[PDB]
Write an enzyme that holds these catalytic residues in place. Sequence first.
Site, mmCIF file in Angstrom:
data_model
loop_
_atom_site.group_PDB
_atom_site.id
_atom_site.type_symbol
_atom_site.label_atom_id
_atom_site.label_comp_id
_atom_site.label_asym_id
_atom_site.label_seq_id
_atom_site.Cartn_x
_atom_site.Cartn_y
_atom_site.Cartn_z
ATOM 1 C CB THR A 200 -1.002 -0.022 1.169
ATOM 2 O OG1 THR A 200 -0.289 -0.144 2.399
ATOM 3 C CG2 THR A 200 -2.040 -1.134 1.042
ATOM 4 C CD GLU A 203 1.922 -2.462 3.690
ATOM 5 O OE1 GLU A 203 1.235 -2.545 2.646
ATOM 6 O OE2 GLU A 203 2.165 -3.440 4.431
ATOM 7 C CD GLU A 204 5.336 3.586 -3.315
ATOM 8 O OE1 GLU A 204 4.123 3.419 -3.580
ATOM 9 O OE2 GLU A 204 6.114 4.242 -4.043
ATOM 10 N N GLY A 205 5.712 4.480 1.667
ATOM 11 C CA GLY A 205 6.266 5.666 2.311
ATOM 12 C C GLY A 205 7.206 5.319 3.447
ATOM 13 C CB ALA A 208 10.172 5.956 0.705
#
Lengths: 285, 43, 51, 238, 44
Positions: A200, A203-205, A208
């Site tokens: 999601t 999650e990606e953030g 990162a």
Amino acid sequence: GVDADTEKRINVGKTHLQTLRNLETRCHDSLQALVVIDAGSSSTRTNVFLAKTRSCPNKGRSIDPDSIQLIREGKRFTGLRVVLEEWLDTYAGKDWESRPVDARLLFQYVPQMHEGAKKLMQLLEEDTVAILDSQLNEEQKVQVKALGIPVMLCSTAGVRDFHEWYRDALFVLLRHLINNPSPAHGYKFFTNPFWTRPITGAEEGLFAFITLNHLSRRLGEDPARRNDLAGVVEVGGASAQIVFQEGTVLPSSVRAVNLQRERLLPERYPSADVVSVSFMQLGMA
Amino acid sequence: GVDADTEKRINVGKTHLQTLRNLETRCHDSLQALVVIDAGSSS
Amino acid sequence: GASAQIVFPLQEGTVLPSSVRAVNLQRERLLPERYPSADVVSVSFMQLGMA
Amino acid sequence: EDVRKNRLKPLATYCVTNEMQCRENSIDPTKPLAERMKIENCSIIEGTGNFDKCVSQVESILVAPKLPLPANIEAASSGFESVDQVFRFASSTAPMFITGREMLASIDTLKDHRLLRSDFSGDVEELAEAAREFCSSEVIIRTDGPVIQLPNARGEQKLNSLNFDLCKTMALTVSLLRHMAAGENQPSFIKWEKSIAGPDGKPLADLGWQVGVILHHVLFTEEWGRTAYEAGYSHNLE
Amino acid sequence: SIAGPDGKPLADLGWQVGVILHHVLFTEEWGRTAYEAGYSHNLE
């Protein structure tokens, strides 16, 4: 004379055993390859990485975090969204977007979804091996093949859930394709439901944020003050993320994301309570 | 007829995914060899 | 009197949309790890309370 | 004119208060997919060239909307509905890094045209002064592609599929920095990066979720050893 | 030799099986030396 000959001969024999005894006790470093498949709304591309593994007696094998280095990023192939969209146009009809279509009736076209995923996976395997053969030398390939290559195919924010069964089943088929690769190249590619999974925006953030702090040498075992970590504002194609003072009174409706409790960072690494927000409406498209 | 054809075709596709999902979760058995060298005073 | 509560064990392998969250008793430190893991649908409504 | 090639498709597909929030943002779920993203009583879009009006619109629509989208609370998300509420209640002095291909290009284009100074301070008004001159540029049809003519002879550059929508991203950068300054706590420094250099001088890996996914499996010494070494490739073997 | 459930003995009597078990039974330690390190340990 005879004394200089005897003393040197004993020394060579003594240093021979010393070197042999050290090999059994000391830790051994081996090169390992890591594959991450960036599956998005626009394209599905491979990313080949390199890492140094430490093999210590009675301790096991562990990857040196600082040793993680990207070698080459693969070519942009057709996205997973299009793979399923073409499967819905041929087996359910072009009306699927507006006209209601039964999901139970599409369960008969499962091996047809397997063939569609096989077409993309063979190209992703071809691209990965092409990078591995051109970037690694002969001694590197001995270490890389013997250990085995873990694959992390993740479908980021932008790929729609479809609200049925299509996307979930496709991932089961994708994992089977990775776990059963071509034995010609020798590169042992493998995965599990933990590594290969859909991700999601939020999650990606978080990943990162872990990436930025690792590269900046901020994220480490030794604490500086809670570790001194730098925030990130990533405005991608489909979704935009904002992940970043001390002990502030926060509302009940909003929760401070702890990377240690959410199983993203171990207990040995300093505690990190961050403000993780992701908005699809701010993403480029 | 058409109902018997559709119901069986869906069932084959459903059992295909069920078998694939089981392989990921269930434990796998592999054969391994173990060598013990009996070194003594005689042999 | 003040508020109404509805707490019950969650269906095994539910949809679980990102709008809502499942309340784990062991993760919320209400129950120890030795006792079996339980995820519940814990909700409280002030508007449904007797007064 | 395609339904899949349409940029409003991810918003149209997803669309208790969720139905009300989508309808108020012009995406009616009851309406069919064809007219859901189709702009009512509109045929031609004309560029007026005003940065201050673009900033106010990006603020009222994207950055700080009065009626925002659901913005659900998952295991990874904090819970904030919009950008304006993030820096209002949860502002931090921690350093910030602004990433994104279109985001980095917004600063670079102003730097190369001499409007934005070589020193990347991150001052909102210094960024707004440079973008006000660039976004108020004329467009003329040329022999070798259309050119972007800057006012009062500042320079010129070729117009492409990534240059025309760059001014909207410039307004997003100005609006986002305005909320950062308005908050209780302000970051230590504001920097723009494409990749972070290591001890050798060259970057080990590119920015994104890629390295984070590796680390979150790798760092757990026991679990990584059990799945990647104990089980390994030998697991899927008959 | 001691007969198993099939009627035939699995292994001969002596120290042989005891040496295997005293390494094998320790699930964590066996996994670290025989699977985590394995043959890949002695590799340049």
